[PDB]
């Protein structure tokens, strides 16, 4: 019932992942509410459960499938299923443990993790920060099989959680900002892997201050600067939407606009 | 909703100190970073510290060495010493929790302390 989109890594190129990346938008939003030339998610509040969840059907080389779900409201990994499996993140509230039940209906093995999937706890169990964790089509290839095993216990946690966070990034944060697209289609463009820099994993902390800002803006302008990352390490402050137009591709809905 | 509760801000002569601290309404393990923030007089409100659930610390632009922050996990505070203190340090001083919520890292604040440094 939920819109479905595919991918495979197996024979990916620049045009596949693009395209890719540019469906997964297309259904996450709309293109209804638009603010300072960026798109806002639908807002959670009172979204009809029919509209919530978007599917991304991942392949890879050895043809194995897992397909995600992602909730539209924050472009985000909510659980997958594998087969006959199904397996969610710990939900951290009633609306969403409710909304979830939605998903995978007819799975006959269905699981939900005691633990979230936030970074912070993917972290944590993976035994590994995202700085020390390689993207690219590589990884992907092995995250769809570590999560595709995961079932039958052929995956030990600390790998799904590492797979996840392999996910996460090259698909909810490449859809969330431009740049991270960019980040991994020069990883494909070049067959290499490599860990986030520092400008990437400062984005992605990022992305709820940047939605904030941007929404509760004076006519453009932060009423405090976000400091983000550049590749090298250091340190710059943003302080008002206009630069981060090329940069951000989906923002997380914070409150309403004026007409 | 966290709560976070800050003290230490007074009134200090020149090469004076202050210990600042932000205790939470919850164990701030919970967070992934807390931080402080200083607003001066005619700026805007900037990063003093911030530091990670794993003890990874940065600090604003020549303020390491002069200021430390530092977390206490039998007291759940994050605390800011701050040595040497020059006019230029004069602000309102903000204790941050950031918190990871439903795939969001998103911020609470306290109400702030302010610091005067006078001659």
């Known amino acids: 019932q939920y819109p479905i989109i595919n991918f495979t890594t197996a024979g990916a190129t620049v045009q596949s992942y693009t395209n890719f990346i540019r469906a997964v938008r297309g259904r996450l939003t709309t293109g209804a509410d638009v603010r300072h030339e960026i798109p806002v998610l639908p807002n959670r509040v009172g979204l009809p459960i029919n509209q919530r969840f978007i599917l991304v059907e991942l392949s890879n080389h050895a043809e194995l499938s897992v397909t995600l779900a992602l909730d539209v409201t924050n472009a985000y990994v909510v659980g997958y299923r594998a087969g006959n499996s199904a397996y969610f993140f710990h939900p951290d509230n009633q609306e969403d443990a409710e909304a979830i039940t939605h998903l995978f209906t007819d799975v006959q093995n269905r699981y939900t993790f005691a633990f979230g999937g936030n970074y912070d706890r993917l972290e944590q169990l993976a035994g590994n920060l995202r700085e020390n964790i390689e993207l690219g089509n590589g990884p992907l290839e092995e995250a769809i099989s570590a999560l595709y095993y995961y079932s039958t216990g052929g995956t030990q946690l600390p790998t799904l959680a590492r797979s996840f966070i392999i996910c996460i990034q090259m698909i909810s944060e490449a859809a969330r900002f431009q740049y991270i697209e960019g980040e991994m289609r020069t990883r494909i463009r070049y067959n290499r892997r490599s860990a986030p820099d520092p400008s990437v994993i400062t984005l992605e902390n990022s992305w709820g201050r940047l939605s904030t800002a941007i929404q509760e803006s004076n006519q453009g302008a932060f009423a405090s600067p976000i400091q983000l990352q550049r590749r090298n390490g250091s340190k710059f402050s943003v302080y008002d939407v206009s630069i981060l137009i090329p940069i951000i591709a989906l923002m997380v809905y914070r409150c309403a606009p004026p007409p | 909703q966290v709560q976070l509760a800050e003290t230490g801000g007074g009134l200090v002569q020149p090469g004076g100190a202050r210990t600042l601290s932000c205790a939470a309404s919850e164990s701030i393990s919970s967070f992934y970073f807390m931080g402080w923030y200083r607003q001066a007089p005619g700026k805007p409100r900037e990063l003093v510290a911030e530091?990670?659930?794993?003890?990874?610390?940065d600090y604003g632009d020549s303020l390491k060495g002069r200021f430390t922050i530092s977390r206490d996990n039998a007291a759940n505070t994050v605390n800011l010493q701050m040595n040497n203190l020059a006019p230029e340090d004069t602000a309102l001083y903000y204790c941050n929790a950031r918190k990871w919520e439903r795939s969001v890292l998103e911020d609470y604040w306290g109400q702030g302390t302010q610091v005067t440094v006078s001659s």
């Open positions: 530091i990670s659930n794993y003890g990874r610390t």
